[PDB]
Amino acid sequence: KYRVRKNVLHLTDTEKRDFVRTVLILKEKGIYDRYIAWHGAAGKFHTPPGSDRNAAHMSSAFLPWHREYLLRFERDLQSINPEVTLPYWEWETDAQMQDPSQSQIWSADFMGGNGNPIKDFIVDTGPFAAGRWTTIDEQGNPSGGLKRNFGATKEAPTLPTRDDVLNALKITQYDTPPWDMTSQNSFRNQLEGFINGPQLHNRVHRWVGGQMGVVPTAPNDPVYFLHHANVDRIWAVWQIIHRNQNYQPMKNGPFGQNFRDPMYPWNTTPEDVMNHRKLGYVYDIELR
Amino acid sequence: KYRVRKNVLHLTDTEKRDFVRTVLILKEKGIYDRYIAWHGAAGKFHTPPGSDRNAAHMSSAFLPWHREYLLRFERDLQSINPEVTLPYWEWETDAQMQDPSQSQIWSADFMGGNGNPIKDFIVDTGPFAAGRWTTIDEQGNPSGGLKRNFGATKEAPTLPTRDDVLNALKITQYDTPPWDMTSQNSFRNQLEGFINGPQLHNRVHRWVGGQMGVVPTAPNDPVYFLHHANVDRIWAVWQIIHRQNYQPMKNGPFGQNFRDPMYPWNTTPEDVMNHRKLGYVYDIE
Ligand SMILES: [Cu+2]
Ligand SMILES: [Cu+2]
Ligand SMILES: [Cu+2]
Ligand SMILES: [Cu+2]
């Protein structure tokens, strides 16, 4: 209950500077690519082999895996700069904007802007613009510049709304069998976004486009971590509302999805990360 | 210095049955596939990106990466059965056999045998035969059964010899720039087997053939860990002789330095320099 994770829009100009800089040091040092690599590797670790589920997505472990992923990322930020925490992108109130692409998350001091359609939607404003920041493909080889193309697809012309978030929060079951992209009455799968998708989390991905629009390479965009810090906040809220409800499956789901299974590529289990305050951080909304 | 890693040949028959039965349990629960995916994952972590070094192979971290790999494998064995430790395949002794396919590591008691030519060298003896042991491919999806083909290729018709291990233990530097396949006068690159390759460790892989014959999928064959436990032994012996240390200390590509994290873990080469302090020993030491 010590590290405060703040709304992106409520950050000072100096917090934005410090956060963007630290991400660049992680990337210069070779550390950032550990996260890209981990994310792609998890998407090829199917539970069970030959299943549609993987360690990080499309199953029950979606939420705690990303919680652990962000915790490691944030710990790496703090070794470079202890006054830096992982902010969250509250996309559901950007969606209420007249033009959500006008949100200050996309200003040249922070994430940078939409892609340049003259440059095949390469990003050229902000600290991760082409030239300043090199992306990596699934094979681990340099893949050019970061790309974004906001709202360009028919399936996801808008960010999720606050009504979308509130409605996912009424769901009482953390997850339901068969613990996959077809789970019904499942807050995991509703938040993940496969319920007549892409909704919520999956929709944000498709709305941003570029690397963000395909899951394995999505973390090539630093906004991936801000996005998932929002998802993690929403999960943390659901845990406060539905305090009697617990992770599922407790047991007899596929190996790597049960409460006490290790989450590849780590030994960390869902149980280890069930209490976010226990990991040493809160979201600013929990404190007024 | 409390868990003993024994030569395969010196294992009692109850030990061989216990080793094989644990590995099949690790595979049944889903745990063995974490090592298979970890190994494929680390091959596509290139240091730096776009280069041919990767996290596990073809660079300085080859030796510490596998020692950590094997230590994690042994801990998973022990958690299922605390009597089971990781044996090592001393292939340099087996090299002197006219026909090392006759070694008792390959009995139906243990790893099973060579691939069957009539069946595209599918392994059909021992506990890991087809129908008893599933393989998975580089993309991460079920493949079609263990394969082996001892000494088939012309580059690796023979196992490496006790002569080769002694010419490796002669090199005084752990490693040398550019910390890649071309590294001259390097114990690490000599033991890995790229000088006059395929030599030593690389030779064993190409000698076995089948899944062991290609970098990323080789852990599909349980003999991968017995082989690498021997590579670990040979390194552990080197660290006695040359009470030297690891290179690069700094300024190498990230993921290769003494204090870099070894993708896909946080463990550093410094973390695993002392195998006794990790809690195990080999016999004859
Ligand atoms: Cu993800
Ligand atoms: Cu995501
Ligand atoms: Cu290996
Ligand atoms: Cu090997």
Q: How far is the CA of A150 from the centre of ligand 1 (A)?
A: 19
Residue in B75, B265, B73 with CA at minimum distance from that of residue A266 = B265
Question: How far are the Cα atoms of B32, B79, B222, B249 from residue B25, in angstroms, in the given order?
Answer: 9, 11, 13, 39
Q: Are B146 and B210 in contact (CB under 8 A)?
A: yes
**Pairing, β A122-123 against β A115-116:** antiparallel
Query: What are the tokens at A156?
Result: 């996801």
* CA-based nearest distance A68→chain B, Å: 14
DSSP state of A244: T
Q: How far apart are CA B179 and CA A285, in angstroms?
A: 49
Q: How far apart are CA A211 and CA B142, in angstroms?
A: 28
To the question of whether residue B227 is assigned a binding role by annotation, the answer is: no
CATH classification at residue A33: 1.10.1280.10
Question: How far are the Cα atoms of A94, A129, A159, B108 from residue A16, in angstroms, in the given order?
Answer: 18, 16, 23, 63
Name the amino acid, one letter, at B148.
R
Query: What are the tokens at A192?
Result: 């993940």
Beta bridge partners of A4: A282
Q: How was this structure determined?
A: X-ray
Phi, psi of A54 (to 5 degrees): -135, 175
Q: Are A274 and A247 in contact (CB under 8 A)?
A: yes
Q: How far apart are CA A19 and CA A81, in angstroms?
A: 9
Q: How far apart are CA A56 and CA A40, in angstroms?
A: 9
3-state secondary structure of A235: helix
3-state secondary structure of A29: coil
Residue of B nearest to A141 (CA): B50
**Chain A interface includes B140 (CB < 8 A):** yes
Element (H, E) at A200: helix A200-208
* Cis peptide leading into residue A49 (ω within 30°): no
Question: How far are the Cα atoms of A245, A260, A266, B222, B238 from residue A256, in angstroms, in the given order?
Answer: 20, 8, 10, 22, 38
**Chain A interface includes B29 (CB < 8 A):** yes
Residue in B234, B213, B194 with CA at minimum distance from that of residue B63 = B234
- Domain limits for position A237: 3-287
Q: How far apart are the first and last CA of chain A?
A: 14
Q: How far apart are CA B210 and CA A271, in angstroms?
A: 39
**Chain A interface includes B49 (CB < 8 A):** yes
To the question of whether residue B10 is assigned a binding role by annotation, the answer is: yes
Q: Are A218 and A148 in contact (CB under 8 A)?
A: no
Q: Are A164 and A154 in contact (CB under 8 A)?
A: no
What sign does the dihedral B43-B46-B50-B51 (CA atoms) show? negative
Q: Do B40 and A44 touch (CB under 8 A)?
A: yes
3-state secondary structure of A283: strand
Q: How far is the CA of A39 from the centre of ligand 1 (A)?
A: 6
Question: How far are the Cα atoms of B99, B116, B149 from residue B119, in angstroms, in the given order?
Answer: 21, 5, 11
* CA-based nearest distance A155→chain B, Å: 28
To the question of whether residue A205 is assigned a binding role by annotation, the answer is: yes
- Write down the residue that tokens 């910390």 correspond to: B179
Name the amino acid, one letter, at B278.
L
* CA-based nearest distance B47→chain A, Å: 8
**Chain A interface includes B31 (CB < 8 A):** yes
Q: Are A215 and A202 in contact (CB under 8 A)?
A: no
Query: What are the tokens at A133?
Result: 């920041």
The beta-carbon neighbor of A34 closest among B40, B134, B263 is B263
Residue in A109, A111, A71, A76 with CA at minimum distance from that of residue A91 = A111
Cβ density class A8-44: b for 16+ within 10 Å, e for less = beebeeebbebbbebbbebbeebbbbbbbbbbbbbbb
3-state secondary structure of A7: strand
* Cis peptide leading into residue B48 (ω within 30°): yes
From the number of C-beta atoms within 10 Å of its C-beta (0-12, 13-18, 19+), residue B50 rates as: exposed
Q: Do A46 and B260 touch (CB under 8 A)?
A: no
Q: How far is the CA of A36 from the centre of ligand 1 (A)?
A: 10
Q: How far is the CA of B215 from the centre of ligand 4 (A)?
A: 7
Q: Do A30 and B41 touch (CB under 8 A)?
A: no
**Chain B interface includes A249 (CB < 8 A):** no
Residues 6+ apart with CB under 8 A from B190: B167, B168, B171, B199, B200
Chains A, B: CB contacts within 8 A come to: 78
Number of domains in chain A: 1
The beta-carbon neighbor of B142 closest among A30, A38, A49 is A49
**Pairing, β A134-136 against β A142-145:** antiparallel
Alpha carbon dihedral B26, B28, B31, B34, in 10-degree steps, equals 120
> Which long-range contacts does B114-121 make (Cβ < 8 Å, 24+ apart)?
B114/B148, B114/B149, B114/B150, B115/B147, B115/B148, B115/B149, B115/B150, B115/B209, B115/B210, B120/B147, B121/B147, B121/B148, B121/B149, B121/B152, B121/B209, B121/B210
Q: Do A49 and B141 touch (CB under 8 A)?
A: yes
To the question of whether residue A227 is assigned a binding role by annotation, the answer is: no
What number of other Cβ atoms are within 10 A of residue B244's Cβ? 12
Residue of A nearest to B34 (CA): A264
